[PDB]
Amino acid sequence: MIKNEIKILSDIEHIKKRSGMYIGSSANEMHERFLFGKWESVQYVPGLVKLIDEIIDNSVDEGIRTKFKFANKINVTIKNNQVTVEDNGRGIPQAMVKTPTGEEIPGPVAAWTIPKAGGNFGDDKERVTGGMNGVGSSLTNIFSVMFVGETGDGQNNIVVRCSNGMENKSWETIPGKWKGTRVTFIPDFMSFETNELSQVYLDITLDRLQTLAVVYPDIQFTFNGKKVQGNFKKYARQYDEHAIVQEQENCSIAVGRSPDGFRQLTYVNNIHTKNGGHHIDCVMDDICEDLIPQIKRKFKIDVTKARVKECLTIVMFVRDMKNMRFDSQTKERLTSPFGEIRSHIQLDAKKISRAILNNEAILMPIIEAALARKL
Amino acid sequence: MIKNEIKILSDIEHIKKRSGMYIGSSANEMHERFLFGKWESVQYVPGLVKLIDEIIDNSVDEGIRTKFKFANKINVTIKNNQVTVEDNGRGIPQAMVKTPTGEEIPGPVAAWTIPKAGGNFGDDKERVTGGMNGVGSSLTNIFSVMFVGETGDGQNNIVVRCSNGMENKSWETIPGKWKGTRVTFIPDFMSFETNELSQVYLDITLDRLQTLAVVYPDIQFTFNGKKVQGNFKKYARQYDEHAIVQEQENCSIAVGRSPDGFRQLTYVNNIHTKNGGHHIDCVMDDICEDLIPQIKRKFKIDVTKARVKECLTIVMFVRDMKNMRFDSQTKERLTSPFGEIRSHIQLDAKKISRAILNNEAILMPIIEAALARKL
Ligand SMILES: Nc1ncnc2c1ncn2[C@@H]1O[C@H](COP(=O)(O)OP(=O)(O)NP(=O)(O)O)[C@@H](O)[C@H]1O
Ligand SMILES: Nc1ncnc2c1ncn2[C@@H]1O[C@H](COP(=O)(O)OP(=O)(O)NP(=O)(O)O)[C@@H](O)[C@H]1O
Numbered sequence: 093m094i095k096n097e098i099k100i101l102s103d104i105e106h107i108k109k110r111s112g113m114y115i116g117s118s119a120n121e122m123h124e125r126f127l128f129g130k131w132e133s134v135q136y137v138p139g140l141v142k143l144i145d146e147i148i149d150n151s152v153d154e155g156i157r158t159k160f161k162f163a164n165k166i167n168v169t170i171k172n173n174q175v176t177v178e179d180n181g182r183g184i185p186q187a188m189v190k191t192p193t194g195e196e197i198p199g200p201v202a203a204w205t206i207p208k209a210g211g212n213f214g215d216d217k218e219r220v221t222g223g224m225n226g227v228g229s230s231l232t233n234i235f236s237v238m239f240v241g242e243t244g245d246g247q248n249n250i251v252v253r254c255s256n257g258m259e260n261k262s263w264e265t266i267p268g269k270w271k272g273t274r275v276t277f278i279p280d281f282m283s284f285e286t287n288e289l290s291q292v293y294l295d296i297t298l299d300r301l302q303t304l305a306v307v308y309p310d311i312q313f314t315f316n317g318k319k320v321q322g323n324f325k326k327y328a329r330q331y332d333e334h335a336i337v338q339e340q341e342n343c344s345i346a347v348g349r350s351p352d353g354f355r356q357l358t359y360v361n362n363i364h365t366k367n368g369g370h371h372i373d374c375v376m377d378d379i380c381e382d383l384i385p386q387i388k389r390k391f392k393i394d395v396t397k398a399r400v401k402e403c404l405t406i407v408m409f410v411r412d413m414k415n416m417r418f419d420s421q422t423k424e425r426l427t428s429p430f431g432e433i434r435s436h437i438q439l440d441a442k443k444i445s446r447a448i449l450n451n452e453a454i455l456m457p458i459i460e461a462a463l464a465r466k467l
Numbered sequence: 468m469i470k471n472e473i474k475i476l477s478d479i480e481h482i483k484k485r486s487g488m489y490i491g492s493s494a495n496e497m498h499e500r501f502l503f504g505k506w507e508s509v510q511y512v513p514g515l516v517k518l519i520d521e522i523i524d525n526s527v528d529e530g531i532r533t534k535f536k537f538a539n540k541i542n543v544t545i546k547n548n549q550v551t552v553e554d555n556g557r558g559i560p561q562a563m564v565k566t567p568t569g570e571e572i573p574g575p576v577a578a579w580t581i582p583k584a585g586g587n588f589g590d591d592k593e594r595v596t597g598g599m600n601g602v603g604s605s606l607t608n609i610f611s612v613m614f615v616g617e618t619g620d621g622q623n624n625i626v627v628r629c630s631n632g633m634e635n636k637s638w639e640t641i642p643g644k645w646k647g648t649r650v651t652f653i654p655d656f657m658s659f660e661t662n663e664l665s666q667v668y669l670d671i672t673l674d675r676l677q678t679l680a681v682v683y684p685d686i687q688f689t690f691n692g693k694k695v696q697g698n699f700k701k702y703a704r705q706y707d708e709h710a711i712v713q714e715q716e717n718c719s720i721a722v723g724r725s726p727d728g729f730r731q732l733t734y735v736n737n738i739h740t741k742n743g744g745h746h747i748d749c750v751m752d753d754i755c756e757d758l759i760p761q762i763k764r765k766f767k768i769d770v771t772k773a774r775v776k777e778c779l780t781i782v783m784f785v786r787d788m789k790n791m792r793f794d795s796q797t798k799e800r801l802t803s804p805f806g807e808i809r810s811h812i813q814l815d816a817k818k819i820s821r822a823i824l825n826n827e828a829i830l831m832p833i834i835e836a837a838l839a840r841k842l
């Protein structure tokens with residue numbers, strides 16, 4: 093007898109109880125990843141990072157929605173454990189919405205306090221925003237001791253003041269000409285194996301904002317008062333001095349050395365696919381299938397597709413993909429159809445193949461054991 | 468202007484609309500993975516596979532709950548697109564449950580038709596069942612054109628007859644001495660890029676049941692009338708004739724060659740962590756940190772931790788872990804704290820290190836390029 097008693101859970105309850113299917117690990121652990129081009133190994137709690145990224149994602153969504161005519165200044169601030177994200181998008185439409193449970197609640201209130209409530213539930217094939225599930229804001233709110241969202245459309249502002257894991261919710265409206273979005277929160281450090289939003293979280297969010305600045309040059313980000321600049325070839329050279337780049341229509345990619353296994357920083361629209369997934373798998377495949385031809389052809393050697401890739405760092409931004417799909421709320425693994433991906437990425441792997449064959453620093457580790465095993 | 472209109476979605480709606488955060492890809496695609504020890508590359512739609520695995524997981528959960536005194540025969544059948552899973556656990560307690568939306572609904576009805584309803588919402592630190600979220604059954608039901616669950620506790624049976632994505636639900640009860648669980652369903656092939664539960668799905672589910680038979684020798688599985696047998700050393704040798712095994716308290720692990728990058732089949736209780744995650748990362752680390760000592764010590768060579776692992780296949784079952792945690796409903800990535808993992812796996816990496824140094828077939832590819840680069 094382990095009891096098998098059936099119980100039913102509210103959305104908020106379920107978010108609290110199965111938090112890691114919603115935001116990730118609470119534990120303060122050591123992960124390997126990229127910071128400023130360096131494959132370091134650093135200690136953070138992944139869920140805390142997500143709490144920030146949700147609010148950022150939302151602003152960058154609005155920039156996307158309006159082709160950067162709106163939300164082209166995004167101001168991020170991290171000061172004594174308080175995260176502030178301000179943008180100049182159009183604000184959250186203040187119109188009201190009806191929940192099936194009778195109630196009648198202002199637009200932004202539901203956006204921020206009701207899971208399964210957002211503005212990315214349209215025709216999937218046309219959805220270009222990184223946002224889609226309608227939950228990430230409520231996640232930051234549910235895991236915040238204080239959460240305060242301010243939007244205004246140019247007419248009036250609504251403030252939604254939330255405390256203690258969104259069990260205190262209140263909202264007021266006052267007229268105003270301001271038009272944009274501000275969100276401020278303090279994480280609930282009881283759901284996390286830290287008690288401080290210490291310096292590493294500052295490093296990550298800057299690093300994220302640097303990467304967002306190169307995907308999205310029409311947005312001027314600022315972190316803690318300092319504007320974030322961006323030049324893609326400059327960015328890429330942070331990962332390997334001896335890197336090489338190619339930029340297409342819906343694509344910017346860079347290839348460089350790795351000392352210790354395939355590494356990849358890889359973006360799909362405004363989303364960091366830290367676990368890779370289909371897009372990077374497919375382009376590494378199309379890459380390797382011109383390379384191993386030429387390499388076995390230029391040198392008569394056999395090297396494996398794992399050998400090629402266990403020596404590359406890759407950086408790839410895919411812009412403007414419709415209806416992108418993932419296997420988790422954490423959007424860490426692009427899971428869209430291989431065919432539709434390959435339709436968007438117009439990858440000239442031929443190009444990319446010849447330039448990697450003409451870059452000794454990059455080419456040599458691939459074929460090295462193979463050449464030394466030939467004699 | 469892309470419109471930013473806020474909308475609210477029911478649980479079922481959200482499952483339908485964001486299905487891939489719940490079950491995975493609908494697309495009929497080519498994935499690399501293990502079947503019967505062979506790293507083949509085969510074509511399936513991952514979500515369809517999940518629809519089966521949910522119902523299986525549930526029976527194996529009950530076997531776990533009752534230390535295999537119940538649910539030690541589990542009968543799986545796949546015939547003309549109809550999946551049947553029968554077990555002899557205690558049945559789903561027929562008592563009633565109250566939803567916050569007023570209603571009063573029999574235990575098994577909610578289990579199978581209400582998301583966020585199950586019997587794995589107890590004290591997390593004591594939860595040993597692979598089940599935890601209370602949604603997988605409703606997922607099979609939501610993505611089934613016909614779903615029919617039968618349980619009885621020894622007193623009576625309830626039948627819950629569901630059709631067309633769980634928009635037709637009905638249930639009846641009749642007394643009976645039968646005590647166990649039967650679930651039968653036909654997938655809704657409109658949410659998937661196939662129209663047939665063709666032979667590959669048979670191959671996968673047998674392969675899964677073979678793997679479950681070696682983790683759980685106290686359960687006699689049968690697939691389509693044929694009982695599934697199990698001997699761990701026999702299983703392991705399917706992945707590499709020249710494999711090697713070690714079996715501890717909460718651990719069975721096997722190590723063998725790989726021709727093309729780190730491969731791993733890896734189980735945590737009754738769950739296939741196809742994406743690996745923490746447990747395999749941590750034990751590969753503890754493995755490599757005695758190996759690279761001895762290897763640089765037995766041969767004065769430097770090989771990388773990616774080099775070691777890019778040559779291993781690993782098979783690892785971790786049994787009996789409390790409160791295991793993942794980053795998605797698909798339970799594909801064990802995400803529990805590195806410390807708690809290492810507490811459960813009492814890994815004698817020392818042992819495992821010396822035996823891999825004493826197995827030429829396994830040792831030689833690691834150090835090979837390194838030795839040939841030494842002269
Ligand atoms: N900065 C912003 N500018 C404009 N609208 C916003 C902003 N932040 C939130 N919103 C609105 O509030 C809604 C709340 O959605 P949210 O709960 O964050 O999930 P989502 O962004 O829609 N998808 P996801 O975060 O991936 O689960 C959004 O869909 C927008 O309509
Ligand atoms: N074969 C079975 N034997 C006993 N009880 C069962 C069986 N199948 C379902 N149940 C019960 O029905 C509930 C429904 O849960 P379900 O919707 O499948 O999600 P879950 O198994 O609890 N967790 P998860 O599948 O990971 O989301 C279970 O928690 C059990 O209490």
Ligand SMILES: [Mg+2]
Nearest residue numbers: 146149228229
């Ligand atoms: Mg968001």
Ligand SMILES: [Mg+2]
Nearest residue numbers: 521524603604
């Ligand atoms: Mg289940």
